[PDB]
Amino acid sequence: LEPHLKVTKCLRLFNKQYLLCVQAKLSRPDLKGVTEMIKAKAILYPRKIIGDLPGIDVGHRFFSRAEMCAVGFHNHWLNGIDYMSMEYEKEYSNYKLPLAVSIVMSGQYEDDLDNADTVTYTGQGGHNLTGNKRQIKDQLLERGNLALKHCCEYNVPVRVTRGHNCKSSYTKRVYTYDGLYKVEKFWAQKGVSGFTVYKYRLKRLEGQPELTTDEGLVCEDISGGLEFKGIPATNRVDDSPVSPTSGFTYIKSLIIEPNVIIPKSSTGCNCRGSCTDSKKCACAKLNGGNFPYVDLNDGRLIESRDVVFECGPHCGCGPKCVNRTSQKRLRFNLEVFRSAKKGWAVRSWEYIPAGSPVCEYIGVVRRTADVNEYIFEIDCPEFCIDAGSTGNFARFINHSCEPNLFVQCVLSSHQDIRLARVVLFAADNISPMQELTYDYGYALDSVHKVKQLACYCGALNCRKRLY
DNA sequence: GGTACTCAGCA
DNA sequence: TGCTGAGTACCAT
Numbered sequence: 001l002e003p004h005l006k007v008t009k010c011l012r013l014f015n016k017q018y019l020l021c022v023q024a025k026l027s028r029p030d031l032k033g034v035t036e037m038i039k040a041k042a043i044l045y046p047r048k049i050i051g052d053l054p055g056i057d058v059g060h061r062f063f064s065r066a067e068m069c070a071v072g073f074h075n076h077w078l079n080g081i082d083y084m085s086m087e088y089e090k091e092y093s094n095y096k097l098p099l100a101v102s103i104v105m106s107g108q109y110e111d112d113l114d115n116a117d118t119v120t121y122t123g124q125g126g127h128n129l130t131g132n133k134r135q136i137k138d139q140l141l142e143r144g145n146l147a148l149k150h151c152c153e154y155n156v157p158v159r160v161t162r163g164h165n166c167k168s169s170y171t172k173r174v175y176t177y178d179g180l181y182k183v184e185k186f187w188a189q190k191g192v193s194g195f196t197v198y199k200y201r202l203k204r205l206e207g208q209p210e211l212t213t214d215e216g217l218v219c220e221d222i223s224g225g226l227e228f229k230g231i232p233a234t235n236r237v238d239d240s241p242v243s244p245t246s247g248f249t250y251i252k253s254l255i256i257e258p259n260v261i262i263p264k265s266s267t268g269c270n271c272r273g274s275c276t277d278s279k280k281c282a283c284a285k286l287n288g289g290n291f292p293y294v295d296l297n298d299g300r301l302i303e304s305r306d307v308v309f310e311c312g313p314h315c316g317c318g319p320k321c322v323n324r325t326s327q328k329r330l331r332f333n334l335e336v337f338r339s340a341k342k343g344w345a346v347r348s349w350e351y352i353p354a355g356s357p358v359c360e361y362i363g364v365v366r367r368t369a370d371v372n373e374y375i376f377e378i379d380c381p382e383f384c385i386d387a388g389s390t391g392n393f394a395r396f397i398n399h400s401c402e403p404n405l406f407v408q409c410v411l412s413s414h415q416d417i418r419l420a421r422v423v424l425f426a427a428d429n430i431s432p433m434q435e436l437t438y439d440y441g442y443a444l445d446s447v448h449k450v451k452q453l454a455c456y457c458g459a460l461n462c463r464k465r466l467y
Numbered sequence: 468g469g470t471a472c473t474c475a476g477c478a
Numbered sequence: 479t480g481c482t483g484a485g486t487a488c489c490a491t
């Protein structure tokens with residue numbers, strides 16, 4: 001039960017709940033979401049921990065305070081300092097309680113100084129959560145300050161998490177784990193506002209990844225200009241400047257061979273403008289009585305379902321309709337880069353919230369009887385999609401045994417499952433310049449004694465065999 | 468058992 | 479540049 005994976009699954013559950021709280025129109029669905037993580041005893045580390053957390057590495061990117069609570073990394077949704085209560089005294093007799101374990105520098109306290117390798121961190125108290133957000137009374141050595149003090153005195157390190165601001169439309173604020181720091185020293189003094197503040201000077205420990213500061217182009221756009229956002233391709237692995245789009249034509253829509261059937265068009269729903277009441281929508285009744293997508297960040301798929309029934313050609317609703325999510329244009333600035341032994345593979349340059357549709361696997365719908373590398377069989381196999389010579393960028397996405405994408409079948413133009421639409425959604429929250437991948441799901445010893453293909457996932461859980 | 472405290476996150 | 483938010487952490491006015 002590998003740590004990074006337990007972490008991944010925890011976060012995915014939190015995201016499920018989150019989205020179901022945003023759909024249910026509740027207030028603070030992040031908070032609500034972690035409340036529902038507590039209801040279900042589904043918080044990865046429920047007791048507190050001095051040091052690193054398995055599966056959470058130096059560099060880890062949390063997308064909200066709520067995530068950090070949902071995993072148990074930082075159990076306060078508000079507090080800068082998370083520490084051990086006196087409830088830990090018999091467990092840790094050798095130390096004196098309370099004891100800081102995780103702090104967050106968000107830039108909310110005026111007397112903070114962030115110099116990266118070293119930090120002068122102001123304790124809590126006398127702060128104004130509203131208004132100017134500034135010190136309004138004197139700080140004492142009474143809580144986080146006391147615990148931080150005890151950290152200094154007993155040589156206990158603290159995890160440090162920084163809040164960063166983003167350009168990425170959908171993500172406004174990210175939180176990065178930058179490692180264990182040590183309280184070098186501490187002292188009381190007046191602050192910028194004239195009120196006594198306590199200051200803690202932490203120095204970053206060693207034996208952890210460095211703290212970095214946050215072309216080889218072969219084609220401007222692998223899309224012909226067809227995509228809403230261009231997809232740039234770069235090789236830096238060679239100056240052998242072949243393009244990914246050689247001998248291949250980019251298409252935005254599906255192509256059907258004459259051998260292949262065109263199913264009867266779905267009847268659709270009659271609501272106008274946008275499907276909101278699910279009483280009145282047939283497309284909602286098709287989905288179990290409740291829409292599968294939520295109206296957040298341009299539509300996010302709540303959770304995987306066998307098939308998803310979208311609004312089709314005949315529905316009275318327009319293209320913005322939240323039940324037409326995977327129909328909309330490319331949200332994300334992507335890139336097709338040359339990998340060292342995966343061939344080409346793709347990655348994002350901006351943040352992809354979990355549940356956002358990345359893209360639909362587009363090619364030529366051929367009959368499975370009629371059939372090298374680039375073929376997606378449709379099971380939800382009578383029919384398949386051959387992206388061999390023509391298709392979109394979906395054919396450049398690699399396999400991983402630890403994917404950040406998953407396969408959802410979507411039905412919109414017809415109600416025939418065999419010709420369902422293969423759409424790939426984000427299973428996790430994805431960060432820029434990191435590789436997008438899904439699981440091909442090949443059963444072993446399938447292709448022919450035998451024959452197999454080595455795997456270059458990089459995943460600690462690689463099976464080492466694609467097939 | 469009750470409540471003060473708190474470096475978010477909203478439009 | 480409003481203002482709610484929920485789960486401690488500690489104590490029982």
Ligand SMILES: Nc1ncnc2c1ncn2[C@@H]1O[C@H](CSCC[C@H](N)C(=O)O)[C@@H](O)[C@H]1O
Pocket residue numbers: 341342343344345373374395396397398399400454455456457466
């Ligand atoms: N996890 C993986 N390990 C090794 N090779 C992979 C892989 N996933 C995909 N590939 C290679 O690439 C094919 C996927 S289609 C996209 C990759 C392709 N080489 C390209 O960049 O154009 C696979 O059939 C496989 O041969």
Ligand SMILES: [Zn+2]
Pocket residue numbers: 269270271274275276280281282283311315317
């Ligand atoms: Zn409708």
Ligand SMILES: [Zn+2]
Pocket residue numbers: 274275283311312315317318321322323324
């Ligand atoms: Zn609709």
Ligand SMILES: [Zn+2]
Pocket residue numbers: 268269270275282283310311312315316317323
């Ligand atoms: Zn409809």
Ligand SMILES: [Zn+2]
Pocket residue numbers: 400401455456457458459461462463464465
């Ligand atoms: Zn693998």
